[PDB]
Amino acid sequence: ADTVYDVTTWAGATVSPYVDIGAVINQIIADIKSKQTTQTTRPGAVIYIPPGHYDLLTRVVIDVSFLQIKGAGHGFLSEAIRDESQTGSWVETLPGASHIRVRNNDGHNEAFLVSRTGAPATVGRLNSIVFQDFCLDGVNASKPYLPGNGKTGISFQSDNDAVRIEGMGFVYLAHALIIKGADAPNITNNFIAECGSSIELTGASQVAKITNNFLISAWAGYSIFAENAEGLQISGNTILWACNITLSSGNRASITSNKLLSNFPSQIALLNNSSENLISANHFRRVHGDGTSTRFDDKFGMVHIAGNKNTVTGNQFSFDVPSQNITPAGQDPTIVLVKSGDNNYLASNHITSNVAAKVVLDASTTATRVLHSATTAQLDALTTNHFMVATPSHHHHHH
Amino acid sequence: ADTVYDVTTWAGATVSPYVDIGAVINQIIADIKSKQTTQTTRPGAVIYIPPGHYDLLTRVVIDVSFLQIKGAGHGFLSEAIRDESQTGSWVETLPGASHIRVRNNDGHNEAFLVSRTGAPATVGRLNSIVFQDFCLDGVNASKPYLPGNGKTGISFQSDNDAVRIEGMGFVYLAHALIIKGADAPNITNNFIAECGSSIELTGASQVAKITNNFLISAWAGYSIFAENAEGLQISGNTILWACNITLSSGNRASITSNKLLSNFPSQIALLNNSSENLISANHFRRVHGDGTSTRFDDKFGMVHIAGNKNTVTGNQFSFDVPSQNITPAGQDPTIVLVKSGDNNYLASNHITSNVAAKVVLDASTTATRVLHSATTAQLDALTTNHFMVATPS
Amino acid sequence: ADTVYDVTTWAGATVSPYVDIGAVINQIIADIKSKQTTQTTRPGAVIYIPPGHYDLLTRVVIDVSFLQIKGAGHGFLSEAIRDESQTGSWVETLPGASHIRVRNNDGHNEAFLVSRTGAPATVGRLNSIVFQDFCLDGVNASKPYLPGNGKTGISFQSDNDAVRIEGMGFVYLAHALIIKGADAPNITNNFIAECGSSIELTGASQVAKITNNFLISAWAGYSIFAENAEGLQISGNTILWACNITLSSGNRASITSNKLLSNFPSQIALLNNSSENLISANHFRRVHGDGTSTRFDDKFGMVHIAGNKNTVTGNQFSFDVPSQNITPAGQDPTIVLVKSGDNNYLASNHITSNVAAKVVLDASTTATRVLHSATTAQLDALTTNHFMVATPS
Numbered sequence A: 001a002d003t004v005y006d007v008t009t010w011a012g013a014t015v016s017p018y019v020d021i022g023a024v025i026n027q028i029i030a031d032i033k034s035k036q037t038t039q040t041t042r043p044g045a046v047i048y049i050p051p052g053h054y055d056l057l058t059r060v061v062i063d064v065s066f067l068q069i070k071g072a073g074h075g076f077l078s079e080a081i082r083d084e085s086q087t088g089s090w091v092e093t094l095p096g097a098s099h100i101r102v103r104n105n106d107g108h109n110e111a112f113l114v115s116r117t118g119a120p121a122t123v124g125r126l127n128s129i130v131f132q133d134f135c136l137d138g139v140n141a142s143k144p145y146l147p148g149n150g151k152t153g154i155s156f157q158s159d160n161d162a163v164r165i166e167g168m169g170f171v172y173l174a175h176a177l178i179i180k181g182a183d184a185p186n187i188t189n190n191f192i193a194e195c196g197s198s199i200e201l202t203g204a205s206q207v208a209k210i211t212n213n214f215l216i217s218a219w220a221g222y223s224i225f226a227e228n229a230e231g232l233q234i235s236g237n238t239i240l241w242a243c244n245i246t247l248s249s250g251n252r253a254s255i256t257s258n259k260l261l262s263n264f265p266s267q268i269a270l271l272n273n274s275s276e277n278l279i280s281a282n283h284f285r286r287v288h289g290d291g292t293s294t295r296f297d298d299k300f301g302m303v304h305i306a307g308n309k310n311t312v313t314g315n316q317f318s319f320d321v322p323s324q325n326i327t328p329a330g331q332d333p334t335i336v337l338v339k340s341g342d343n344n345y346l347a348s349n350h351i352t353s354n355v356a357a358k359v360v361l362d363a364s365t366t367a368t369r370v371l372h373s374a375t376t377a378q379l380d381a382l383t384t385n386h387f388m389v390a391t392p393s394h395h396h397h398h399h
Numbered sequence B, C: 001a002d003t004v005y006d007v008t009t010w011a012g013a014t015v016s017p018y019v020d021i022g023a024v025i026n027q028i029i030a031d032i033k034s035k036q037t038t039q040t041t042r043p044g045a046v047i048y049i050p051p052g053h054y055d056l057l058t059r060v061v062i063d064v065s066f067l068q069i070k071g072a073g074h075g076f077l078s079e080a081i082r083d084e085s086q087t088g089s090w091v092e093t094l095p096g097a098s099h100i101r102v103r104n105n106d107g108h109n110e111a112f113l114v115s116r117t118g119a120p121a122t123v124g125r126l127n128s129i130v131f132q133d134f135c136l137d138g139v140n141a142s143k144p145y146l147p148g149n150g151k152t153g154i155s156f157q158s159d160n161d162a163v164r165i166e167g168m169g170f171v172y173l174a175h176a177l178i179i180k181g182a183d184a185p186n187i188t189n190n191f192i193a194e195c196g197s198s199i200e201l202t203g204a205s206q207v208a209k210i211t212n213n214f215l216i217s218a219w220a221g222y223s224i225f226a227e228n229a230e231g232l233q234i235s236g237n238t239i240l241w242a243c244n245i246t247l248s249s250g251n252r253a254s255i256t257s258n259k260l261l262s263n264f265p266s267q268i269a270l271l272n273n274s275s276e277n278l279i280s281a282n283h284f285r286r287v288h289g290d291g292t293s294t295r296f297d298d299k300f301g302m303v304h305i306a307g308n309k310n311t312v313t314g315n316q317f318s319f320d321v322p323s324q325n326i327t328p329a330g331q332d333p334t335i336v337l338v339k340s341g342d343n344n345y346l347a348s349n350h351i352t353s354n355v356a357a358k359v360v361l362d363a364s365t366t367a368t369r370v371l372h373s374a375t376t377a378q379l380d381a382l383t384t385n386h387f388m389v390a391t392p393s
């Protein structure tokens, strides 16, 4: 069929894909549009990228639904370790597989911009665009990669439904993936590492599914940033280095069955009246020393809650930071800060820390329940408007 | 190798795949069987479907193990939204990618029937058939799509082992996926929406794995129906619109780490003595208005339990239905109905509701434990044969 | 591009891949090395294996980063059932899809050895090698398959980063997958069954991700074995027959949202000071009779803990073993054995058993908390140094 393209064998290209794969892909998209010319004759296409090192000089603009861009794998290599190592005898020093080196010279910072102008009720949304099994690489960057090199991998900037980002590698980018106005996006089985931020769901979103990923962005950005997100599902991910899942006015999220690790506070922040979110069956680990930052102090919380009726159940909170490195100096670090809101619920969580640490209930909070989720020594309730059923501990009395 | 076929380039096809891809696939299957003729020379084949709009007029019948049918993506477009919109200027109005329009003219309702004749002990089960990354579309349908247009995407009707349905799109079908007599089926990473039912595991099943899907079927059918299911695993799914997971004599299921939402009751129903099932670390949301139905009233439960020794832990039950729309009128809605059974266990669940709502223990139940899973006001126990450790209030 | 190879069509092959696919893949790798000759010109390659039956006689050695070897599916057929059946009329008797019959005659046990010698700081690690959607088969084996036929599917024996094993089938091997010194491996969506052991992470590992697999190895080995593992994530798996997840000096693991079943003790063993590991939202089922062993007796535990500060929350422990088969004879079997360690935490778990069964706290343990995770009758505390908040009875 004429809907199958390979960037290296398609003869209609006027530049080599090794020189500018962005120009080649744009030319393929123009070819698709010349063949798929009515609303009932636009099934889309597949563009295959074989293993190779490809420079991208021109931003790709996708306004075609059902476009699949696929390669041979995620191609990750730790450029951060490379850049701290003596690499003269390394067998390879670049990420690989189907490897796009993001090198725009066109005044734009995105390798891929997925965007259609118009009112969605009038022109239709972008639907079921698929990025699978290729590598996007910013080539050179320094920690924490934000602002860094300013480069973005994939950015969706118009309303979209059922998009799919699967099996990819993203490395050395300021922003790996940005999706504005996402409805039911599927972000799964990716390897995002050594980037400023990993996933940003901007504007608003409905029922995003973020599953089975490695998310390894650093401490200036977010692993998952979600603005006005309804119904987010975040599960089965390994989120490392500077795990930071921030919801701003997000509700009815399900954040379950993840491995979550940071060298910094704010592993989950439910901000700006984020309510009825579940945080269940996750392992949280806070450590120190893989980078340092004062973006947050240790009173911010491993989990920070500003909202109502959230549920924190069945998790482990494991904290190991040397006392001399805790901030503000001399203070007890915070495991969960319930900063504001009503009827939040913590139950059946185990808190293990190298120094005394606290669940803090701000004086403004109401009806918070803390049920086998803190010993007496682990609760710092700044209002009497809470219910405590303590995790058992000894020495209630002094004599 | 000659085991790789593309429906648009295979020279043996006597019909265009755009006109009837079902006939083309059946011709390929006949070719495979002509070349793979003994029990040690049947490795199977791959059929690739490039992006395109393909009509299916003839049901495909598969009795070949290790057949992979694969395309370029799930291809979903909301035909429900399209059908309530003014679409003259829409850039596209059809689902796409590798897009099969299910339009049988042969009197059958399935696009794909996977079925082998004979006793499995004598002829073997069907093994490791793979459907990946294509779109099955019923073309025209009206809510709630059941009975709807009567169309079925894929139906497995004989005993099978290790089948795999991955990365697919299904839309505007009465039944997206039906698997009878499945052992270790893998149903993962799919997008099933605007269908009557999404997944039906019929007859019986053993250790089915249903993970990482979007399931968005409507209120007359089931998101997941499984009868005589041993060991079902359901995790990592986003199940929306009319989430309804019904187990009929299902035991030892693990239903965990899902996002579950419905505009109707019966988000999970453990029916016909379904026992020793785990429901843990799920977010449940009940809302109202995206369709209406009287199939269940609000006393049925967001979770409904008829069975023994089930375990409900670490979930949120979030309920928001205007009082004037609650049924029966004026009555307190039910979060969990323990309808019958012994030694069921509810612990460490948070119930948040816009009106007073209850966990109801039917008078026939025995030894139910409700442990930090309901305040006193949230328990309506109709038998003293239970144990309550109240969520404080 | 010349970085794409098919073992059945590549013109450089001097051996048939059906006779020795190992030789053909080794020849492809030599070709890759001849074309990709500097540290900035080694993007790797893809090797496609179409459906077919291929013997492997020569071990493949991979020391090239970013090599993908991919086929048409997992190809599983239950050879165990075949070998106890009358198969004269079976339509197929062999696993299929892209099917490698592991038949080494070169003095080695592995089909694939992934190894780069010499110091990772000097030569680099092996990075992002991908095995996808093919079948590795030991051809003939007898239960429990370990030591069995001695055959290994894939063995990584040098430090590696971001490797990926996805969608594969492994059957009738002593060891399906071994990875030594793994950093962020991704082992996902596989079907590993009727093998001695399924996944072994040796030496040490960091942040392995094991998700969405069927793991069906038998009772002499391990479903998942990990030594010196930091941060292992195990979730969404269906682990059957002889589920045994053993961590030796493993810490900060997250073992959640799995369906876990064994006919034997030791479904999870946290051994040799394994600490701060989470076991949450899993369904555990212990049954008897699908094979028998005296490797462990029933006092070992469904879960066995030797370490500190672990967390066991929101699970079901379902135990069904006839009293006549429980060992030591006449003794109550153990659900969770806290063998040694400090500050372990059990909360909101439901224990259901056909006979009296216990959480046992060894006399050496300190500060164990057991909170709505055992009735009084289900706790056998052999030290007064614990906290009990009983499940009501």
Ligand SMILES: OC[C@H]1O[C@@](CO)(OC[C@@]2(OC[C@@]3(OC[C@@]4(O[C@H]5O[C@H](CO)[C@@H](O)[C@H](O)[C@H]5O)O[C@H](CO)[C@@H](O)[C@@H]4O)O[C@H](CO)[C@@H](O)[C@@H]3O)O[C@H](CO)[C@@H](O)[C@@H]2O)[C@@H](O)[C@@H]1O
Pocket (backbone or CB within 6 Å): A120, A121, A125, A159, A160, A161, A180, A181, A182, A183, A202, A203, A204, A205, A206, A228, A249, B081
């Ligand atoms: O548009 C076609 C069709 O899509 C449907 C499918 O259900 O969804 C609409 C869609 O776009 C909505 C859009 O604006 C939503 C908006 O509100 C959010 O944020 C508010 C707080 O400010 C919340 O109170 C509110 O509940 C949320 O919806 O987002 C803006 C920023 O907040 C608000 O000004 C809007 O009212 O979302 C994007 C990103 O903001 C905008 O471009 C859209 O107008 O929803 C998804 C994104 O979630 C998108 O794919 C859809 O087009 C249906 O409603 C429409 O008929």
Ligand SMILES: OC[C@H]1O[C@@](CO)(OC[C@@]2(OC[C@@]3(OC[C@@]4(O[C@H]5O[C@H](CO)[C@@H](O)[C@H](O)[C@H]5O)O[C@H](CO)[C@@H](O)[C@@H]4O)O[C@H](CO)[C@@H](O)[C@@H]3O)O[C@H](CO)[C@@H](O)[C@@H]2O)[C@@H](O)[C@@H]1O
Pocket (backbone or CB within 6 Å): A296, A297, A298, A299, A300, A301, A328, A334, A337, A338, A339, A360, A361, A362, A363, A364, A382
């Ligand atoms: O970290 C930078 C630097 O700023 C300070 C002072 O702003 O702390 C900021 C930080 O922690 C503040 C903390 O307590 C704030 C406190 O006061 C709030 O409430 C009062 C009314 O009850 C108001 O008068 C006041 O304006 C508000 O800030 O909250 C407690 C009552 O709940 C009071 O005892 C405190 O004075 O916030 C939490 C409680 O929410 C405490 O644990 C903290 O001490 O802000 C973030 C948390 O949001 C944390 O990371 C920062 O330390 C100074 O303390 C720091 O050196």
Ligand SMILES: OC[C@H]1O[C@@](CO)(OC[C@@]2(OC[C@@]3(OC[C@@]4(O[C@H]5O[C@H](CO)[C@@H](O)[C@H](O)[C@H]5O)O[C@H](CO)[C@@H](O)[C@@H]4O)O[C@H](CO)[C@@H](O)[C@@H]3O)O[C@H](CO)[C@@H](O)[C@@H]2O)[C@@H](O)[C@@H]1O
Pocket (backbone or CB within 6 Å): A081, A290, C120, C121, C125, C159, C160, C161, C180, C181, C182, C183, C202, C203, C204, C205, C206, C228
């Ligand atoms: O250091 C920067 C930063 O990078 C991270 C990212 O994960 O680590 C990458 C790094 O890991 C080392 C590596 O090998 C460690 C090795 O030895 C360990 O285990 C032994 C047995 O317990 C101990 O004797 C030894 O002390 C431990 O370090 O693990 C292999 C198996 O034992 C041995 O062959 C290795 O020497 O860790 C993984 C395995 O867990 C391997 O893939 C790695 O090589 O890798 C680079 C290159 O080697 C090295 O600089 C880093 O430590 C993170 O941990 C750090 O914060």
Ligand SMILES: OC[C@H]1O[C@@](CO)(OC[C@@]2(OC[C@@]3(OC[C@@]4(O[C@H]5O[C@H](CO)[C@@H](O)[C@H](O)[C@H]5O)O[C@H](CO)[C@@H](O)[C@@H]4O)O[C@H](CO)[C@@H](O)[C@@H]3O)O[C@H](CO)[C@@H](O)[C@@H]2O)[C@@H](O)[C@@H]1O
Pocket (backbone or CB within 6 Å): C296, C297, C298, C299, C300, C301, C328, C334, C337, C338, C339, C360, C361, C362, C363, C364, C382
């Ligand atoms: O081959 C089976 C055969 O071996 C025996 C020998 O006892 O059991 C081994 C087995 O269970 C042992 C079990 O109890 C051990 C016990 O003693 C330990 O602690 C004492 C100090 O407190 C030491 O004097 C003694 O040497 C240590 O072994 O532990 C209890 C105190 O915690 C004592 O009452 C017991 O005598 O281990 C657990 C407790 O950890 C009990 O439930 C068991 O009875 O070892 C594994 C468990 O690690 C289990 O599978 C085996 O049965 C004999 O009992 C069997 O016939």
Ligand SMILES: OC[C@H]1O[C@@]2(CO[C@]3(CO2)O[C@H](CO)[C@@H](O)[C@@H]3O)[C@@H](O)[C@@H]1O
Pocket (backbone or CB within 6 Å): A078, A080, A081, A084, A193, A194, A216, A241, A290, A291, C161, C162, C183, C184
């Ligand atoms: O394993 C994937 C690779 O991701 C890492 C994780 O650790 C980081 C980021 O990428 O590496 C730098 C080393 O400078 C650390 O600061 C940061 O954690 C690689 O380390 C790892 O090998």
Ligand SMILES: OC[C@H]1O[C@@]2(CO[C@]3(CO2)O[C@H](CO)[C@@H](O)[C@@H]3O)[C@@H](O)[C@@H]1O
Pocket (backbone or CB within 6 Å): A161, A162, A183, A184, A206, A207, B078, B080, B081, B084, B193, B194, B216, B240, B241, B290, B291
């Ligand atoms: O009439 C619109 C119908 O479509 C819905 C909502 O939209 C879908 C499918 O069914 O579901 C998600 C919403 O997030 C979208 O991907 C997809 O279009 C029904 O809920 C609604 O009745």
Ligand SMILES: OC[C@H]1O[C@](O)(CO)[C@@H](O)[C@@H]1O
Pocket (backbone or CB within 6 Å): B057, B102, B103, B104, B105
């Ligand atoms: O499925 C509906 C379609 O199927 C047919 O009955 C046979 O192909 C068409 O006449 C009709 O439009």
